[PDB]
Amino acid sequence: SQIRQNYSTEVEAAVNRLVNLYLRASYTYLSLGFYFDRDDVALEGVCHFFRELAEEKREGAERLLKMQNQRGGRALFQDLQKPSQDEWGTTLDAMKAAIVLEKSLNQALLDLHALGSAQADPHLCDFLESHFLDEEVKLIKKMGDHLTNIQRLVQAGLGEYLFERLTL
Amino acid sequence: SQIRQNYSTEVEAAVNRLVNLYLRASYTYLSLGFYFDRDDVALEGVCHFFRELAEEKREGAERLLKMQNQRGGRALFQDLQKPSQDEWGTTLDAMKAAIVLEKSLNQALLDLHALGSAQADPHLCDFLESHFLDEEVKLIKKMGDHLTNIQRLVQAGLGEYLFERLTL
Amino acid sequence: SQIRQNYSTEVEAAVNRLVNLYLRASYTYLSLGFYFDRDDVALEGVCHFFRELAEEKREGAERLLKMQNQRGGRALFQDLQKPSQDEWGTTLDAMKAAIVLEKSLNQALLDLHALGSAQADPHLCDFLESHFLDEEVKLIKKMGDHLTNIQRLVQAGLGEYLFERLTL
Amino acid sequence: SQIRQNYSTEVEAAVNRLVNLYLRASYTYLSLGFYFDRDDVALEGVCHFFRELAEEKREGAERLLKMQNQRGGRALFQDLQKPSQDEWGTTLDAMKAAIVLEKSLNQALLDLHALGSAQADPHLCDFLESHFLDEEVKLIKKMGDHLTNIQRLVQAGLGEYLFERLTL
Amino acid sequence: SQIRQNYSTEVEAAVNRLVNLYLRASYTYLSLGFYFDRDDVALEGVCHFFRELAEEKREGAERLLKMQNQRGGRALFQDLQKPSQDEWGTTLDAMKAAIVLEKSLNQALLDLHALGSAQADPHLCDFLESHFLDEEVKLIKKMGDHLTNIQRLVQAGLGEYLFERLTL
Ligand SMILES: Cc1cccc(C)c1O
Ligand SMILES: Cc1cccc(C)c1O
Ligand SMILES: Cc1cccc(C)c1O
């Protein structure tokens, strides 16, 4: 690219991989959201929580794709793997799955930051710090808070209802 | 009728029957509503839920009667049978009874749609699709969601109170 | 009932009967209204007059049902008999039928008031006086005024049109 | 056409025919409107009624032409036959002629719907149901209501005047 | 009195007694209210419920005193007996005590109405019907509704908390 400067092929490839991970996360959250919208699950607050996260993850992917082009890299898309489960169990099970997912995204962000530092690419490092790393820490803290509250509420049916009504 | 066109006697009769079913449903919901207003039941959210449905079903009947006249058919009214119960048990029992009732109305709508299709009466088919079929699907989904939440809440007294307070 | 006080079984039963009479009146007015909406009758002011009365009578029934519960009585519903006619003739015939109907409701109100007085139930007596007796006197006077005007207008077709256009 | 999909030549031709029928109806209503504007007829409400219908029918034709292009069919225009009469008699005669005209348009709509169903063309079927079939049923009901009122008013001159003044 | 007309000494005395009963009820509610404000009871919604009732009963007494003077009777005050309890137990116990109290006031109202009827004093009868009898029926129905909800909630501590939070 006529504009490409200080942008390694290793970072370019890792950015494409991260786009795939964010889109896969978005898809997972779409599945989680609609599972809680089932008439035999019917926890609307939980459905809304996950549908909002599907949107956030898609936005993250789009920000990464915008950055790829700004740097003169070339977006390459791969298949989006279907989510790991078809049914997500209880709100507790779902929130545990979500925190696992977020920690995996966060690790990928940290890995890419480390690569950027090794390649002396401060624009990449700043980009990740500014738009992703703090968002992930905040989200993981929120999920941990939710998990603790869900666990303390498990009369499991009553607890699940109250969490959805009074927290979400 | 000077205006009657493509409107079979079979559909005309079936529309009159459907008016009766909607008015009977409205009456059933009136009974459900006032049962939950009893001082020894006293679940105001549940009373409101069913009184609103009584109004919706009456409106449905009135829309059908308007359509009967628009097509040049002749409204014929029959007795409105009293509701199947005098006392409706718990919120769970009542919501189960309501979903049974709605599924029976929906089946009648589907039967009339099938008759309209067989008689090549697209105005009737459109009318039902536009004003009734989706309303019924939405309502049945809502009732199913409510049933699931009520069931998960059954400390049955506490659960019944919380559902009325926090959902309805 | 824990709340029931000075409320006789005779009044409780008579209130349930009166609910049935009001709902039957509402149904009769629904039939009258839609008859005047027929394309071969087509008197919109008359249709509106009777549909408004259907609503008023239903509201009366609902007020009675509310009162039944306030007093600790138990609502019991019976079948709603179909209206006495399928076709209602001229506006004159219909208005005569309506005044007959209202006078029958008024007599039932007066009978219930008399029962309340005999049972020394002043809350019932006040309730009827406050919400029903004057409403009925006003409505019957209005119908009598309408009958007189309709009769003076009978060139019967022209008169019927003018009454609908200029009074209703 | 590059865009044409599931759109039969039979439906394409029938749509062109229907455009012609709607434009012919519009022309007929233009003639009716100006006849009632003659100084020796002079019924302004009747003139307005028919001029409004001329506009509605032209709009219907334009909607059909828009749809023809949306589907990749090719609009073909034919002569517009002059209306069946040069003078339209009384308001009663004119309203009878209008209801005959509307019933013929409605039959053409029903015929085209049947063709669409036979050709498994649900976009066409929906289009007609959504924009034409209910409009026609409503209009025919209104005309039938008007005919009944005009007939009841026939002192024919006085009745014609009053209908124009008080209904139209 | 120069103004006294159709106002018996029996009714005058009974009105003074009723003033005392209303003021005693107000005092009882003051005691109930402050009991629920104790730091070792601490149910603010319940405190508010009873303090509002203390105000309503005082207003009732003041209305009776105003009426006594309007009729030319002479207000005579007696001691106000201290409430029947110093401590009121649970919300359930308190609501039971309140409904007992209200039923006793209602019986006194009914007794005075009967006296008025026997003395042919229609102003008194109207006064009681208009300002007291329906208020009492409404309040007793509300208390019965509350009792039913409290009973269904008895995990008694949790139920008491939830009723205070979500109903009161
Ligand atoms: C491509 C994709 C997959 C899953 C969820 C979303 C929102 C999305 O855009
Ligand atoms: C139950 C019932 C019967 C007839 C008319 C009305 C409005 C109604 O609610
Ligand atoms: C005199 C009296 C006693 C108790 C409560 C109140 C409000 C009151 O005025």
Curated annotation (Swiss-Prot), chains A, B, C, D, E:
Broad class of where this protein is predominantly found: cytoplasm
Superkingdom of the organism of origin: Eukaryota
Annotated Pfam families: Ferritin (PF00210)
Domain Ferritin-like diiron per the UniProt entry, residue ranges: 5-154
Listed Gene3D superfamilies: 1.20.1260.10
Binding site for Fe cation: E52, E55, E56, E59, E62
GO MF term list: ferric iron binding; ferrous iron binding; iron ion binding
InterPro entries reported in the protein's UniProt record: Ferritin, Ferritin-like, Ferritin-like_diiron, Ferritin-like_SF, Ferritin_CS, Ferritin_DPS_dom
Subcellular location: Cytoplasmic vesicle, Autophagosome; Cytoplasm; Autolysosome
Ranges where the record places region Catalytic site for iron oxidation: 52-59
UniProt keyword Cytoplasm present: yes
Keywords on record: Acetylation, Cytoplasm, Cytoplasmic vesicle, Iron, Iron storage, Lysosome, Metal-binding
Gene Ontology annotations for the cellular component aspect, listed alphabetically: autolysosome; autophagosome; cytoplasm; cytoplasmic vesicle; ferritin complex
Record-linked PROSITE patterns: FERRITIN_1, FERRITIN_2, FERRITIN_LIKE
UniProt record similarity statement: Belongs to the ferritin family.
Description of how the protein assembles with itself and partners: Oligomer of 24 subunits. There are two types of subunits: L (light) chain and H (heavy) chain. The major chain can be light or heavy, depending on the species and tissue type. The functional molecule forms a roughly spherical shell with a diameter of 12 nm and contains a central cavity into which the insoluble mineral iron core is deposited. Interacts with NCOA4.
Miscellaneous comment text of the record: In horse spleen the light chain is the major chain.
Described purpose of this protein according to its UniProt entry: Stores iron in a soluble, non-toxic, readily available form. Important for iron homeostasis. Iron is taken up in the ferrous form and deposited as ferric hydroxides after oxidation. Also plays a role in delivery of iron to cells. Mediates iron uptake in capsule cells of the developing kidney. Delivery to lysosomes by the cargo receptor NCOA4 for autophagic degradation and release or iron.
Name of the protein in question: Ferritin light chain
Native source organism of the sequence: Equus caballus (Horse)
